[PDB]
């Protein structure tokens, strides 16, 4: 199926993000960018989130490729799912009226994670317009946002009705 | 099989609704809207229902896409199954004579659940043209409606008869 | 296989009836009706029967679609399998000489079961010709009907021979 | 373990009620009543509930035996768990301050169930002091009671602090 | 557990009756009869019933041993469960006020079953006090009898009350 | 595979007969009769036999359809396998020189008695043996060689070289 | 449990007979014979039967040991179960009123035929039926009530 | 083993808290209170935490029984594990020097969850002598405390040192 | 894969022979004979052997169909595998230089029947007197390809 | 159970012989020899046989320990089971009337070594000339208890 | 078995260290300390190591209890296994001549890992005599120490010989 | 069982040697040495061998404890099994007449090289063979009979009758 979706340049990120999913998503992105570098991509996101390392891979692939990546939150975008939502092409970041967004993000790899988390926070500040310290507090805490709360925090540009 | 059905723009929702099913249904909806934005979709519903979050995802995708989504209840629509039935395109919401509807609605975020619940009651009120306090009473409790009580309540537009 | 059968508009109901089987059968019915609304369908039945709710779903879908559904009992039609047999298109309900029919009918709510039994009983009365009360007794009792007994009772229209 | 509890005449009903559990509980009740007919029994209840047929078996065994059965709700008593709580010896029905009670209760066996349900409602009316019609509405609806709401509905005699 | 029960001469028959259960129950019976031939046995019964062959094994062992076997129905005694209940020591056959009895009885030669069915109807006739032919009439259809109805019918001696 | 065989109108009955197999075989028979009602079908039988109800279903479907059904015994036809062999189209019932046939046949007890009688009858008719002897021989263990099956009138022909 | 039974010299043969069961039963027989060679053993039989080779092992162990082995049919004794029933100590072979008996029974082929012949002979001596009569009845499907089993010579006494 | 521990009135809570664990812990508590109502109990806690409903059950049983319950944190007490640590007998709440405490707290009844949560914050406020608004801030977010920060915050009475 | 082989009229018998394998092989043989009755079939055999009944079914199907069946032993043909090798079309029975052949063969009454048929057929295929066949079937011996050629089990060794 | 048997110095060898079984049996033998070096051991054998290496380990342990090991064949002793039967203490090797014995035996170099040792030992236990042993080990034959007594595999048949 | 060992106050740590093993070890330690607070304990270690959080739990329990804990390395002590070895009672830390020690240390939070590594490093420095910075380098590197190397570094007190 | 053997101070090493087995064997050795330091231990060995690290652990525990450890080879001692056999108490190293010994021995690669050298040394010392020949023979497939193991000095005695 998602194969048919693929021909329409729609990627569905429908699950927790791990390496597998991250490889899969990166592949699809690279594939589409291969077919038609000039043409837009739609990434739909319903995800509880997942590993920061897996998430950053997708994010990097998004920033890297030529095609603009529009993001659309459907049920939920939490953790790295919310991050990817926020990292969509500007003015192209979308949510449905009932969808929810939670920006909360969960050896010697530890040093590495702390660094990635710092990068993550900074990107999020830039994309949202929030101050870094605000982003820090909010990603360390359990909080939920309605499509409307997320529009007004700067995570999405438009609520699609 | 349902693949063949898909070519005819029929989606079968035949099970309890969870994230998997919700992803599947959403995908099929997006896919069909992709092929042909202008053209109608038939959603057949026999479901015991399920998670309000998974249900709202399907509901949003339905409202969002261009194609009108006709809903048809076959055996049963309960919980989010009844909600989706009720959320079909107006004049296009259908049941079979012996089918049953139960609007009773039974991990994260207690507060989210409560919010979704207010909106679910609200959407039900608009679509059935029913008073909120009534919608609230009947979603709270075990009750089943026949194809006849569903229609009269405003849950479906018409009953399809041989 | 069954797939090849499907191209010939034959559906095989060969097992106990549950939600899965009911979904499957309903789908195949909707599929065939989609291909060719005008053209007949053959439903072969060898089934011990099963859930009344699942059975009624198949029945409603049968009554609902355009194509006429011929029913053919092969080994056995018991419970909802005998009901579906009896619900075949008139003059098109068939059995094999050695096949057997038992109209005895044994997640869900109790009042719903009772509502559905009355309904299934009424339908049976219409189809067999029998008085409602004769049906009520025979569904509560363990009996088998030979094909000839079956044809006499009104469950089938014709027995298949040399 | 619960073996040691047994010697102290404590039964723990810690799970959903099915036939198994119902057999087990009935056995223990009959066993204790065997040892010492004169002496009290303590039934602790943390249960999501279960089958009305299984529940009625325990209830019947409770009413039948000589020993008075005190009931104590710990986490939760729902469905037939709430019913058994309510069916404890009078003035002996107890809950903990944070416990919860839900009296909501979920072929041709159908006729039988409808009858058992009627019996169930009536017993509950008697034990609570509620009118039958009130019991009917409340067991058909999803509702939760604090220890305090349950004390004041008549499901328990005492909140143990 | 059950083991503790066993020391008090209580056997729990808590399940459908098959060869395994039947072997188990027979063993316990022979075991208790071995310990103390003179002393009574309590057999508690909550069972949907089961195989007539497995049932008759337990029955024969009951009749055979010295100890008197009291029977007590708890939730339900159906099929061979109801039979064993009825086959308890006279004046010792007991039910709880809400328990239910159903005397309906649905690798083995068909004639073996036919004969064992008759022999069952006869034993049951002599145990109830009911005439053979009425028992034959009753057990070939579904019914269910309350504790009150089974008392009347001669299936049990006493209801456990107050 | 079998699928390729199917295109040539060969059905292989290679296992014990239960409802599954019976359904499968019936389906294949109905399917072939659907494609070409006029044209012959070859049923190869190597089977230990099985349920009389499942057997009679296949037998009925055989007698019912238009295509003539030739039967060929390969290793063994016992129980309902032997019966189906015997029920092939007349002059079309075949065995291989080393194959064996055993007509011994081992829920409604009243009904299985009926089918048993009906079986015995059909057997008497096709073999032309006394119903008297058919009842002896199906009630006891007996193995016939391909020759012994010829004399009995269970098969018309033994296939050689 | 059957452990407690064992202390009372009761063995329960409650299942199809295979090598495992046969080993078990043989062990228990040898064990009891070890404890008290002089004292009787009670073998209760409810069995659909099984392998002739596994059966003959139990039968041989029975014949071999000193203790007399009484046999009691409870639900059913078929195949080698019926054989072992028949092979109980004389005057000690028992059935319950409703129990049923059915005597119907490289790749080890020549040996199966021998064991079978040996089994038919032993049933002849034990029932008092002619061999030709046993050869007939073990090749065919038939069941006997306690009563018919008494008449045929398969058991001594129906117990009530 | 923990059996031997049990004889010394030591209970080990070494895992995530669910209904099973909660039943187990409750049972052990009731058992010990049964043996010797007067005598102290030691509850060692190394737990990632878990369900608020399962946690409250243990907490209630602790408050309810006669014996004083000393709590000792070993590796970690997070979520309901930290709550139970804090709910130990006063002056008897202990941690090891390297142990960690996280008071962050992450099926039925959204409304119940919310209620339990208010009471959990409240009990934490009493026991730590801390302002509610502070307790509310720190249960809402990811934070871990050392044995030193726990003590100063008022989560434990003293740190046990070699 | 073996599907591709099948289009070339090659059947691979690569495992112990049971009913499943026997059904499979028979089916493939009947299938090929259906496509092209006139045309040869190649049966490659590397098998430890198996049941005499399952074997005889393959053998009969081989004798029965029109196409000539050439047999080729690859690693091993033992038991019914050796028998089917030997039953290949005359002049068409082949082995590879390092392959091995063991003619040892591991209702009883029917089993004893097939066993006799088997010995006779072998005796006819090899030209060996029957009584030599019967000794060699009862005993455990391997033949090198060379020995099997000289014994008359195979027509030619493949080489060069 | 067999635990109770063990206290009576009865070992039951009831299955195919592999390393596991061989370890088990050796352990039990060493254990009993430890308790009471002076006192006899009864080894009951119903076994299809098995690996020659696993077998020889049991055999060596038997020869090695002080207690005399009596062997009793119950259903069957084939392969290494037959060998261990034959290796029982002299005059103490027993079989039951219906039991069967097959002496057929199914680093290669070490395997060929044990095989020779095995034939020799048998030749010594039976009194049969070596070359007769070698024929009979290579071939597939059953001996009735009677035949095994006369062959010198067992000392006495149990009866009466 | 191990049980017999336990009566002799020997604990065997023979596997990777996770929460399970850590709970087990902690329990055994608490148990023995319960039986006889005054008397020595022998902890034998052959372990590839494991989670720092699990390791620190065992360590804290060791430091906490009254009994002195002697440590004996048998095959290998790596990661937290080498740490526990080094944390044995002074003069009581032992190894076998051919055993190996690797102090390299590879659900959880990152800052917590870092806090715990500094701590484990400090402890190691105290115990070995080494400067903190020597420990820091050696834990970040893949090296094995022979028993003699180990004794020289300060990880053990004595090597076990003829 | 083995447990009974344990009371008699017999340990059975009956399988390939891995960490589990090595732990088990070490434990049993430590246990026995705990009960009675003065008293002899009998280690029976039938083993294909295994890991050199696991082997050396057992060997060390043997050399370390007070009790003398007699070794007896039953079926086979290969690899570390042969090594442990050879490392039994002197004059206490035994084999059965038909048993076999193979001294052929097949994560820190640098370390396994060290143990390998140390093994070869101990072997040279106990057999009294040239370290020269010990390196040949452990690097190749060789099977010694009980006699051949006597000459090599791997065992002191062959146990007979």
Swiss-Prot record, chains A, D:
Which reaction equation describes what this protein catalyses? Hydrolysis of proteins to small peptides in the presence of ATP and magnesium. alpha-casein is the usual test substrate. In the absence of ATP, only oligopeptides shorter than five residues are hydrolyzed (such as succinyl-Leu-Tyr-|-NHMec, and Leu-Tyr-Leu-|-Tyr-Trp, in which cleavage of the -Tyr-|-Leu- and -Tyr-|-Trp bonds also occurs)
GO CC terms, sorted:
cytoplasm; endopeptidase Clp complex
EC annotation from Swiss-Prot or TrEMBL: 3.4.21.92
Query: Its biological function?
Result: Cleaves peptides in various proteins in a process that requires ATP hydrolysis. Has a limited peptidase activity in the absence of ATP-binding subunits ClpC, ClpE or ClpX. Has a chymotrypsin-like activity. Plays a major role in the degradation of misfolded proteins. ClpXP is involved in the complete degradation of the site-2 clipped anti-sigma-W factor RsiW. This results in the release of SigW and the transcriptional activation of genes under the control of the sigma-W factor. Probably the major protease that degrades proteins tagged by trans-translation.
Classification via CDD domains: S14_ClpP_2
Q: How does it assemble?
A: Fourteen ClpP subunits assemble into 2 heptameric rings which stack back to back to give a disk-like structure with a central cavity, resembling the structure of eukaryotic proteasomes. Forms large heterooligomeric complexes consisting of an ATPase component (ClpX, ClpC or ClpE) and a proteolytic component (ClpP).
Q: Where is the active site?
A: 79, 104
What switches on expression, per the entry, is described as: By heat shock, salt stress, ethanol stress, oxidative stress, glucose limitation and oxygen limitation.
**Mind telling me which PANTHER family this protein's record contains?**
ATP-DEPENDENT CLP PROTEASE PROTEOLYTIC SUBUNIT
Citing just one GO molecular function, the answer is: identical protein binding
Query: Per the similarity annotation, which family is this?
Result: Belongs to the peptidase S14 family.
Q: Which Gene3D superfamilies match?
A: 2-enoyl-CoA Hydratase, Chain A, domain 1
**What would changing residue 64 to A do, according to UniProt?**
Has peptidase but not protease activity
Q: What is the lineage of its organism?
A: Bacteria, Bacillati, Bacillota, Bacilli, Bacillales
The free-text domain remark for this protein reads: Peptide exit pores open in the compressed state; in this conformation the active site residues move apart and the protease cannot be active.
Inhibition and activation profile:
Low intrinsic peptidase activity is stimulated by ATP-binding subunits ClpC, ClpE and ClpX. Activity is disregulated by acyldepsipeptides (ADEP) antibiotics, which negate the need for ATP-binding subunits for activation and which makes it into an unregulated protease. Each ClpP subunit binds 1 ADEP molecule, which prevents binding of ClpX. ADEP binding causes conformational shifts that open the gated pore of the ring. Protease activity is inhibited by diisopropylfluoro-phosphate. Protease activity is inhibited by bortezomib, an oncology drug originally designed to work on the human proteasome.
Annotated compartments: Cytoplasm
Q: What does changing residue 27 to C do?
A: Has peptidase but not protease activity, activated by ADEP antibiotics
- Top-level taxon in the UniProt lineage: Bacteria
Q: What is this protein called?
A: ATP-dependent Clp protease proteolytic subunit
């Amino acid at each position: 199926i998602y194969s048919r979706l693929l021909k329409d340049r729609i990627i569905m990120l429908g699950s927790a993000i791990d390496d597998n999913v991250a490889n899969s998503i990166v592949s699809q992105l690279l594939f589409l960018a291969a077919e038609d570098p000039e043409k837009e991509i739609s990434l739909y996101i319903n995800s509880p989130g997942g590993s920061i390392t897996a998430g950053m891979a997708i994010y990097d692939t998004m920033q890297f490729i030529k095609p603009k990546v529009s993001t659309i939150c459907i049920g939920m975008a939490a953790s790295m799912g919310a991050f990817l939502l926020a990292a969509g092409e500007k003015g192209k970041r979308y949510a449905l009226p009932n969808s929810e967004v939670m920006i909360h993000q969960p050896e010697i790899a530890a040093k590495r994670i702390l660094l990635l988390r710092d990068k993550l926070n900074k990107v999020l500040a830039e994309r949202t317009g929030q101050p870094l310290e605000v982003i820090e507090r909010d990603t360390d805490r359990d909080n939920f946002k309605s499509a409307e709360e997320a529009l007004e925090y700067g995570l999405i540009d438009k609520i699609l009705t």
